[PDB]
Design an enzyme around this catalytic site. Sequence first.
Site, short mmCIF file in Angstrom:
data_model
loop_
_atom_site.label_atom_id
_atom_site.label_comp_id
_atom_site.label_asym_id
_atom_site.label_seq_id
_atom_site.Cartn_x
_atom_site.Cartn_y
_atom_site.Cartn_z
N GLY A 70 0.85 -1.17 0.00
CA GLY A 70 0.00 0.00 0.00
C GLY A 70 0.90 1.24 0.00
O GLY A 70 2.08 1.18 0.37
N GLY A 122 -0.15 -5.00 0.78
CA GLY A 122 -1.32 -4.80 -0.03
C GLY A 122 -1.19 -5.56 -1.34
O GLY A 122 -2.19 -6.10 -1.82
N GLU A 145 4.31 -6.01 7.12
CA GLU A 145 3.55 -5.08 7.97
C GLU A 145 4.15 -4.94 9.37
O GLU A 145 4.12 -3.85 9.94
CB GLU A 145 2.04 -5.43 8.08
CG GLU A 145 1.21 -5.10 6.84
CD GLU A 145 1.32 -6.13 5.70
OE1 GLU A 145 2.11 -7.10 5.83
OE2 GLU A 145 0.62 -5.97 4.65
N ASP A 153 -2.68 -7.95 7.50
CA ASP A 153 -4.08 -7.69 7.12
C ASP A 153 -4.41 -8.12 5.68
O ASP A 153 -3.94 -9.17 5.21
CB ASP A 153 -4.42 -6.19 7.36
CG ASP A 153 -3.68 -5.23 6.41
OD1 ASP A 153 -2.46 -5.45 6.12
OD2 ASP A 153 -4.31 -4.23 5.99
#
Length: 361
Positions: A70, A122, A145, A153
Site C-alpha cells: 500500500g 497490499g 507489515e 491484514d
Amino acid sequence: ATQNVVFQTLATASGKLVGVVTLNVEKALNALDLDMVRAMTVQLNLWKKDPLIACVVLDGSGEKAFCAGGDVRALYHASVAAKGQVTEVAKVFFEEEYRLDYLLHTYGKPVLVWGDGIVMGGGLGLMAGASHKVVTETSRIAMPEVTIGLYPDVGGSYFLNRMPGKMGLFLGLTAYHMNAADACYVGLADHYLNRDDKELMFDAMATLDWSDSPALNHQRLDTMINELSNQVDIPKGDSVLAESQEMIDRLMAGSLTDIVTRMSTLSTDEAWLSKACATMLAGSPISWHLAYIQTQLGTKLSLAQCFKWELTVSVNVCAKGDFCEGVRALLIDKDKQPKWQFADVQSVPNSVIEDILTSPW
C-alpha cells in the site's frame, strides 16, 4: 480518471474478452493507493457482470514489482494529525481496499495474477484471493507489515491460518521473503512460470477455448498454464519453508511469550532464519500481539468476517498502535530507528490490545 492503474481488454479467437488490469506507478513499485482501489473496483464490477468478459488478469508495470505494498503516505499524514483519534482517512482506506480484495476472491470468473517479481503487503492482498496465482523465478513475496507497526491484514486473518502448521504466524512475525517455491508450498501460488514466459501466456489466452461456464474456464485456464509450466527453463527448486516445517512449528509453539523468548534466544548459521529473527525482534511489540491474536481466531469465520475484524484492528492500530512511528522511521524520516510505544512483549498492556480489538463503531 487515474493514471496509476490502467485497463484494456485482450481479444480472443473465441469472441470472449480477457480484461487486463495494469498497476502503473513503476516509480513507487506499483504501490496501491485509494484512487487505484476505486478505479479497479469500478472496472472489475463492470467486468464481472459482462458476459463477454471470460477472465481477468492483474499485473504491474515494469520488471521489478507486481505490487510492493500500500501507499501509506497519506494515511501516515492524516493519522498523525488527529493524534490517537481514529480517522475517516483510515476507515475509507481500509474499508475500500478490503472490499476490493474481497471482490477478487469471490469474483466467480477466473482472476489470473501475474505475480512476477515483488509482491508484498497490499500487493500480496490483491494476489492472495485470486483463482490463478502465478509466480516466477524472480517472485519475492512477503508481509512486512510487522516492521512498520501494522499487522498481516488484507485477508491474512483468513489465509495465514489456513497454511501448514504455524507457517502463517512465522510469516507474519518475521516478514520472511518467500520465493516461488515457498509460495506454492504454503498455497499463495497455484502455478509457476518464468518471467520471459509472459508473452506466451498471453498468446495462449488469446487462443484458449473460453466458454460460458466460469468453472470450465477455470479448468481450461489451469490446464493451459499447466502445459506452459513443464516448459520452464529455470526450475523453482526447493522450498526452504517446506524443508523447515517441523523446526518452524517448534519455534512458534506455546504462548507469544515463549516464542519471543525462543526467537531472541536462538543462534543459527541459517542466514534466512537469522534475518527472520532480527526482523521480528526489531518490529512493533503491539504487532507481535496482533499477529498472535489472529492465530487464535482459528478458521470458523468466513472471509467476510475476517475483513470486518481487520477493518476494526487496522483502523485502531493506525490511531493507537506503533504504525505512525513505524512509518515515520522506515518511510518519511527514513532513519529506520523506530522507538516503539512499548519496549518488549510483556510491556504492551492488555487494555491497549483490547481497545485495539474493539469496534470504534
